[PDB]
Structure formats: structure tokens, C-alpha cells
Symmetry: D2
Subunit: 121 residues, 4 copies
Amino acid sequence: AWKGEVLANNEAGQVTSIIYNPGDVITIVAAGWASYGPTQKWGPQGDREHPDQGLICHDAFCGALVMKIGNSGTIPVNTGLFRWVAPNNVQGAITLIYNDVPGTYGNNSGSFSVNIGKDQS
Amino acid sequence: AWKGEVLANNEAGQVTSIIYNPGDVITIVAAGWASYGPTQKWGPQGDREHPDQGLICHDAFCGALVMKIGNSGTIPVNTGLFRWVAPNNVQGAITLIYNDVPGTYGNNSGSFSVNIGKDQS
Amino acid sequence: AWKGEVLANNEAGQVTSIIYNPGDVITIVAAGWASYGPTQKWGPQGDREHPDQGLICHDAFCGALVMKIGNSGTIPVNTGLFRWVAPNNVQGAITLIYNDVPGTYGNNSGSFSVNIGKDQS
Amino acid sequence: AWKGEVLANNEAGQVTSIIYNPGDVITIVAAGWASYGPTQKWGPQGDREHPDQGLICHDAFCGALVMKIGNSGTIPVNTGLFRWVAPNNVQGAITLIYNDVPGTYGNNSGSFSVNIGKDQS
Ligand SMILES: OC[C@H]1O[C@H](O)[C@H](O)[C@@H](O)[C@H]1O
Ligand SMILES: OC[C@H]1O[C@H](O)[C@H](O)[C@@H](O)[C@H]1O
Ligand SMILES: OC[C@H]1O[C@H](O)[C@H](O)[C@@H](O)[C@H]1O
Ligand SMILES: OC[C@H]1O[C@H](O)[C@H](O)[C@@H](O)[C@H]1O
Ligand SMILES: [Ca+2]
Ligand SMILES: [Ca+2]
Ligand SMILES: [Ca+2]
Ligand SMILES: [Ca+2]
């Protein structure tokens, strides 16, 4: 299992120790408070009012938690994944990432605390 | 395992099929958008910019997801619980509850989708 | 999870720390060598070439591992149960027992080693 | 998980759909009756009274269930493995094999039924 923090201002995100292998079932729980610039903070689902101005993940709000598995495209995590299995032919290390516009992470703040584990399968 | 909705304006909470028994380990993941009044909506962590005016759970923000197990006091859930074990002498039906001030539920809207599962022990 | 030994000579059997509750999924793995009287020893499946002369469990061979959940009747365990749900409504402490005819346990010998845990549900 | 059968006269063994990966925890439960040549049949622990005359696994009796993980050596399975981690960092597909002397499988009969699953990690 893996337990850690994902920094909102980290454009490259956080490569965890979790290698998602074919057939794996995983569970992720994410918590905390982060900002993509404003004084205000949002949780791992991000800001439902802010427009997508070129986000690394277009299927989640600005300020949401997302991930990559190996060299996959971005996949929404939001508050977490419950006994989740990946789409075909997706595998590799899980990288966790705050959803913002590339080049605009510098004014970000806060973090999410995240637990990942493998479930029975 | 249980999957269901928890309505923000339901003061009674939502009873799930989950009976928490001594020794049980559980995982909860909660998602979605709800309001305790304002036209704006918050995820399962609630509104961190709002004061506690006599909330059912003082250990969570207003608009947060909370729970009771049998006749326990309120326990925070927020975005979820990862492989969690209850305090001794806490057991019975899990009821999920939106965190608000009692009697002020009428102006609430939205809801959270919540998965609960028992883990290996 | 529980690990312990079940003696062939114990007509009372072995209480475990596992309480089976409705909806629980369990796994048991049993190993070792025992006898209901003969010099030869058998594993937890017992002796397939021996007639049933009034065994505590008619659905398993003489010398097999069986169990009770609370005050249920006997349920075969044999070498174990993989991610098993009680097919009947039963509840309570699992007790493990060597399958022999009551009062004939005085010539029995050996024991089985047994692991039991609850699985995700 | 994988649910299948292992035939006593299959010298190569049965390749399963389970790929053991680094960090995996597995549970195996095996049942049934088989023979390495005699009339009698034995369970997945094999015959504790038969000498080792060059068995493919020296850590298990003749007629026992064993396996290989990738190009590992033979690993005893017997009645099964409870929440088990592979030693020495072995990894790869799990192949299940009846323990007998190489070239003497031709007179074998019966089978074991086997369940394999991955556990939480
Ligand atoms: O839309 C994303 C964008 O939102 C605001 O304009 C922020 O101040 C920028 O840093 C960037 O995060
Ligand atoms: O702080 C609790 C309180 O918050 C706001 O004022 C809402 O209008 C009320 O309905 C109540 O939910
Ligand atoms: O059938 C059961 C019976 O089997 C033999 O007769 C044994 O010697 C007895 O002690 C009893 O275990
Ligand atoms: O020791 C193993 C050996 O045992 C007997 O002699 C069998 O007939 C052989 O086929 C072989 O399985
Ligand atoms: Ca920004
Ligand atoms: Ca309200
Ligand atoms: Ca006896
Ligand atoms: Ca043979």
C-alpha cells in the first residue's frame, strides 16, 4: 500500500510505489484542501464553477485529483476509487497529479492526503 | 457492500444495509455535490469557510458527510475511510448523515453517492 | 484472522476468535495428519474408504475437519473454504471439530492446523 | 481469481490465469483425490508413507499439490496457502503440478480442484 501527499503546486505530480498490474483491483481515498490560485481552497473534486482553460484532465474540474497509470492519459480520481479495475491494457506505476493548466502550477497551494491499496481479486 | 445516495435535506440520514460488527474493517468512498443552503455546493468535506453553529458533528465542517453506527455519536466520514476500525463497543447499522444544524435541513439540496465495503480481517 | 490447532481426540473441538456474522465471507485453510483409530493418518478430508457409523457430520468422511457456526449443525470444512458465505442463516463463534463417532474419540491421535480469516464483502 | 483443476497425470502442470507480481499476497485452497499409481487415492498433501524416489518437489510428499511461479523452483502447496507472499522475490505465471517422479506420471489418476485468489496488499 501507499500513503502520502500530493502537492497542488507540483506540475509533475507524485509517482507512488503502486504498480498497477493487469487484473488488479484498487482502492484510493483522498482528502484535504488545495488551491489552483485563489485564496479559497477546494477538495479533491476541485472547483465545479471554474472553466476548463486547458487542464491536464478534461474529465475533472480544475483543482481535482487525477492520475496516470504508466504512460496512460489522465484518469479522474476525485475523492477516490472504490474497488476499481482499470480499462484494458493500462498498467504501470500510479502517478497522482493535481489538475491545473500546464504552466500555471506556480501559484497553487495546499495538498491532498491519499491512501492507495490493492484489494482482493 | 452497499452503494447508495445520501440526501442533503434528510435530517434522519440514510440507513445502509451495512451492520458494523466487532472486529470489522471497512472502506467508504463518498462523492458528489451538496448544499446546506447557499446556491453554491460542496463535496463530502463540506464548507471550511463556514462556522459551527451547533452541527450534529463538531468534528466535521458543515456540509460534510458523517455517520452513526448503531446508537453511537456522530463520526466524521468526509471523502471516506480507508481500512477503518471503530472504537470498542461501537456496533450496529451504519446510518449516513449530511452534517448540518438540527432543524435547518429544509433549505438543503443535492446528495452524495457512497460506497461502503467490508475489508479483509 | 485466527490460527490454531484442532486435536483429533477432543470431542469438544476448538473455539476460535472468529465470529461469523450475516453477510461475512470467510476463507479457511487446514493442514496436518490425524487418525480416528488406525495406525495410518489422514489429512483434513478424512478417510474416503470408511463407512459412516454415526459421525457428527454425515456430509464429510470419518476423520475430516468440520465446524459449527454458533449452535449450527456441523458444516464440512475439509481442506478449507475459499471465499465462502454461509448458505443458511447462521451466526456465532466458529468452533472446529474432528469428525468421529461420539464417545469413540479415545483412540484418536494427531491434529490439524487451521487458518481462518474474513474476506472482503 | 482462478478456479480450475489439476490432473494427476499432467506432468507439465496447468498454467493458471494468475500472474504473481511483486508485492502480491495470494490464497490457495485445494481439494480432491488423486493417485500416483496405486489403487488408493490421497488428498493434496499426498502420501506421507511413500518414500521420495526423485519427486519434482522434495519439500512435499508424493501425490502432493505443488506449483511454480514463473521460472521458480517447485513450491509446495499441499491443501493451500493462507495470505502468502512468495519468497526471494519470485514472480510470473503460477503453474499448478501434481508431485510425482519425472517420467512416472503415465499411471496417475484423479485430480484436485484449486482456487487461487489475490488478497489485500
Ligand atoms: O484555469 C486555471 C487558472 O486559473 C486561474 O486563472 C489561476 O490563477 C491560474 O494559475 C490557473 O490555475
Ligand atoms: O450553519 C448552519 C446554517 O448555515 C446556513 O445559515 C443555512 O442557511 C442554515 O440552513 C444552516 O444550514
Ligand atoms: O467409524 C468410526 C470408528 O472407526 C473405527 O471403528 C474406530 O476404531 C472407532 O474409534 C471410530 O472412530
Ligand atoms: O515414487 C513414485 C512412483 O511410485 C510408484 O512406484 C508409482 O507406480 C510410480 O509411477 C511412481 O509414481
Ligand atoms: Ca494555478
Ligand atoms: Ca441548512
Ligand atoms: Ca475413534
Ligand atoms: Ca506415477
